[PDB]
Each structure stands twice: as structure tokens, then as C-alpha cells.
Design a protein around this ligand. Structure first.
Ligand SMILES: OC[C@H]1O[C@H](O[C@H]2[C@H](O)[C@@H](O)[C@H](OCCCCCCC3CCCCC3)O[C@@H]2CO)[C@H](O)[C@@H](O)[C@@H]1O
Ligand SMILES: *[B]([O])([O])[C][N]C(=O)[C]([C][C]C1=[C][C]=C([O])[C]=[C]1)[N]C(=O)N1[C][C]N([C][C])C(=O)C1=O
Length: 265
């Protein structure tokens, strides 16, 4: 494979789409590879990790419990809710809702959790509290995926999302147990995790959350590294491409291949 930046450029040309990428050391925060890292991209379902960071912050403060069971209704549901649809009779705990939101991208679980943190405005305020002055959530699932050209709603930048993920996972803003819970949810992703493992060389750690929207919008936030370690945060977003889902997946995978083959920096 080409050098990472050369592959990123190639992916843009082939997608006739815009790619945003950062690769960041998890321990120190050093930025290593960056491409359009200050440009805005729809977060799509990648926001669900930040959401559950805010939920965990409430748990740490004693204003929420992961055990607390929410008995929601059918009128609360939006599309792509495979876990929450199974529990109208019996409900789900707040912890189960975060697991469903992160590991199965469950949209109704995400909306239920979003209300508990003050809606899109509440989650945006949490972002400002942790020093992210860029990322913004404006809408609920599933409208937040609309990815209209030029629309700043529901966007982040690769650089902001990577810094925010590092803050949530490692900065001790969250308790030790909460940091470990957030990481474990990403480790347990079922949407893309197992597929990604199936194509990674032996020894490469993966934890992730993916996202998909309109107009070609597609993304992933991940922890990746050799020697079975979460060495780096890698954030890749695509937007404004007419390409097939299959190609968008392959192009992200190709950028990943370039990183794997050319990891020392
Ligand atoms: O020499 C390096 C490696 O070259 C190949 O590995 C290939 C692998 O066979 C292929 O499946 C993967 O595709 C890329 C899969 C990436 C998965 C998505 C990545 C995510 C992860 C977080 C960042 C965003 C994207 O590329 C690597 C590197 O060429 C060999 O198979 C392997 O034995 C060898 O160790
Ligand atoms: B996350 O990325 O925010 C969850 N994403 C969504 O719910 C996406 C669908 C993603 C998807 C792509 C391809 C598939 O085969 C299956 C699922 N939802 C949307 O993009 N939208 C956009 C806007 N409208 C809201 C009126 C939708 O109906 C919708 O679901």
C-alpha cells in the first residue's frame, strides 16, 4: 500500500469525496498523520461515544446510575433500533442503552440517552465543559444524519473528535471505572468490530464506533495498535461522495492498510 497521506489523497480522487483523518497517540495526544483535520464532517453515529461519555459523567457525579431501568414506549422509537425494539415490555437499563447505542448503533437507545443529558444542546454543553469548542450536536436520530452539503449542524472535526475521545478515555475527567466502561463498549462493537478483526493482521488491537449518513457520509472513530495495545486514536470521516457503501468501506479499509504497513513514525 501507499504511504498514509498518499492513500488518503487517492481515496478522495476515487470517491470524488472529501476525507478527514487524524491519527493521534492515545497516551500523549501527539498528532501524527493529519488530513483536513480542522475541517467539519457530520459525526453520524460516532457521536454515540461522546453521548455515553456524558452519561458516565452523570453516573460519576451520582446523578445517574447505569443500573437504572428506563421503561420506554413504542412511540419513542426511531428507525434502526434492533435492541430497544426487543424491550417494550421490560425496558432497558441506562448501561444497556449505552451498550446498544455504541455496539449496535441503536438509534432509539441513543435518543433516550440524549434526553437524559439535556438533548443536543445538553450534549453540546458537555462538549464545551471538557474544552471541545468545535463539535456540535443539533438534532436527534435519525435527522442528524442528513449531511446536507455545507450544513454545520451535527458536525465535528477529526482533530476535535480525537482530542475529545482522548479526554473521555484517559484524562481522568471520568472515573477509572467509567473510563474502563467506555473503552469496553467500543471494544464490544458488533457493527464493524468483528469484520475489522477478520481483516486485521494478527496482533492488531481494535475498538471502534462507526457512523453512516446521507450523501456518502461515513465514518469511524477507533483505537488501533500493534502488540495488542490501544496505541492510537484514528478518526476517519468521508462526506459528499456519490460512492457505494461498499467502496466507502473499502476506502476506509485502504487508509487503514496504509497506516498498518507504515506505522512507525
Ligand atoms: O505486512 C503487513 C501486513 O500486510 C497484510 O495485512 C493486510 C491485511 O491482509 C488486510 O486485510 C488489511 O486491510 C486493511 C483492513 C483495515 C481495517 C479497517 C481499519 C480501521 C481501523 C482504525 C483506523 C480506521 C480504519 O491491510 C493489511 C496491510 O496491508 C498481511 O495480510 C499481513 O500478514 C501483514 O502483517
Ligand atoms: B448513525 O450513523 O447516526 C445511525 N445512522 C442512521 O440511522 C442512518 C442510516 C445508516 C444506514 C446506512 C445504510 C444501511 O444499509 C443501513 C443504515 N440514517 C440516516 O442516514 N437517515 C437520514 C435522515 N432520515 C431522517 C428523516 C432518515 O430516515 C435516516 O434514517
Amino acid at each position: 500500500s501507499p504511504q498514509p497521506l498518499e492513500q488518503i489523497k487517492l481515496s478522495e480522487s476515487q470517491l470524488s469525496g472529501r476525507v478527514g483523518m487524524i491519527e493521534m497517540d492515545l497516551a500523549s495526544g501527539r498528532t501524527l498523520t493529519a488530513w483536513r483535520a480542522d475541517e467539519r464532517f457530520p459525526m453520524m453515529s460516532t457521536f454515540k461515544v461522546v453521548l455515553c461519555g456524558a452519561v458516565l459523567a452523570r453516573v460519576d457525579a451520582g446523578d445517574e446510575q447505569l443500573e437504572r431501568k428506563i421503561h420506554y414506549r413504542q412511540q419513542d422509537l426511531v428507525d434502526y433500533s434492533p435492541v430497544s425494539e426487543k424491550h417494550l415490555a421490560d425496558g432497558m437499563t441506562v448501561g444497556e442503552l449505552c451498550a446498544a447505542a455504541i455496539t449496535m448503533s441503536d438509534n432509539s437507545a441513543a435518543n433516550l440517552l440524549l434526553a437524559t443529558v439535556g438533548g443536543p444542546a445538553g450534549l453540546t454543553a458537555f462538549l464545551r465543559q471538557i474544552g471541545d469548542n468545535v463539535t456540535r450536536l443539533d438534532r436527534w436520530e435519525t435527522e442528524l444524519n442528513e449531511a446536507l452539503p455545507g450544513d454545520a449542524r451535527d458536525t465535528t472535526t477529526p482533530a476535535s473528535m480525537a482530542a475529545t475521545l482522548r479526554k473521555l478515555l484517559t484524562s481522568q475527567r471520568l472515573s477509572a471505572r467509567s473510563q474502563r466502561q467506555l473503552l469496553q463498549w467500543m471494544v464490544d462493537d458488533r457493527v464493524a468490530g468483528p469484520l475489522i478483526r477478520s481483516v486485521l493482521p494478527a496482533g492488531w488491537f481494535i475498538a471502534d464506533k462507526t457512523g453512516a449518513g446521507e450523501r456518502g457520509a461515513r465514518g469511524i472513530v477507533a483505537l488501533l495498535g500493534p502488540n495488542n495495545k490501544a496505541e492510537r486514536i484514528v478518526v476517519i470521516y468521508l462526506r459528499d461522495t456519490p460512492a457505494s457503501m461498499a467502496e466507502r468501506n473499502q476506502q476506509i479499509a485502504g487508509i487503514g492498510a496504509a497506516l498498518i504497513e507504515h506505522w512507525q513514525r
